[PDB]
Amino acid sequence: SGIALSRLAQERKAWRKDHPFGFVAVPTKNPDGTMNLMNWECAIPGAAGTPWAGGLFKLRMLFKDDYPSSPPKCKFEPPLFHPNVYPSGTVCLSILEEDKDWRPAITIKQILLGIQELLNEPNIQDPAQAEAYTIYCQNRVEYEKRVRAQAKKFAP
Numbered sequence: 001s002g003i004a005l006s007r008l009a010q011e012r013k014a015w016r017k018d019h020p021f022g023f024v025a026v027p028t029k030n031p032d033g034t035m036n037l038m039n040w041e042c043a044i045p046g047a048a049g050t051p052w053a054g055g056l057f058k059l060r061m062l063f064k065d066d067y068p069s070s071p072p073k074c075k076f077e078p079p080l081f082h083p084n085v086y087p088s089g090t091v092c093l094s095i096l097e098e099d100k101d102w103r104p105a106i107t108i109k110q111i112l113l114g115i116q117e118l119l120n121e122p123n124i125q126d127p128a129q130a131e132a133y134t135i136y137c138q139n140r141v142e143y144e145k146r147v148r149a150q151a152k153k154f155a156p
């Protein structure tokens with residue numbers, strides 16, 4: 001997809017020039033060793049002063065041939081404990097759905113910062129996983145204890 005590949009090259013150029021500290025976003029490779037702009041390996045650092053602090057959370061960003069008509073699928077690998085992350089690892093976020101808040105102009109930086117924001121502020125009106133959501137609603141202290149354990153587990 002010429003349109004997708006052209007935009008992804010622009011995203012890569014912009015990201016390399018200016019990106020938030022501690023974040024990573026790099027295209028993967030094809031079997032022949034060439035760059036695969038359709039599949040990116042990324043990492044989001046937990047925000048300082050939050051229960052996520054010190055964690056580095058890996059996720060994959062997968063683009064469809066019609067990007068930027070469609071948002072990428074963003075998937076934590078491995079899956080994370082969080083009310084808006086499906087058990088598969090897929091992130092549930094309004095800007096990541098075409099018929100909700102996705103706009104073609106949204107950048108990879110905006111996506112990764114949006115997901116970082118989501119990590120520390122769940123949206124209780126769109127639960128994606130039963131366990132983290134139930135704990136978040138029933139016992140915030142227990143919820144944060146689980147989050148801190150997870151951040152420690154994913155410390156670099």
Ligand SMILES: Oc1ccccc1-c1ccccc1O
Pocket residue numbers: 024025040041042043058059060077
């Ligand atoms: O290991 C990483 C280090 C830095 C950024 C991303 C990854 C990664 C992200 C998703 C899937 C695999 C991966 O290796």
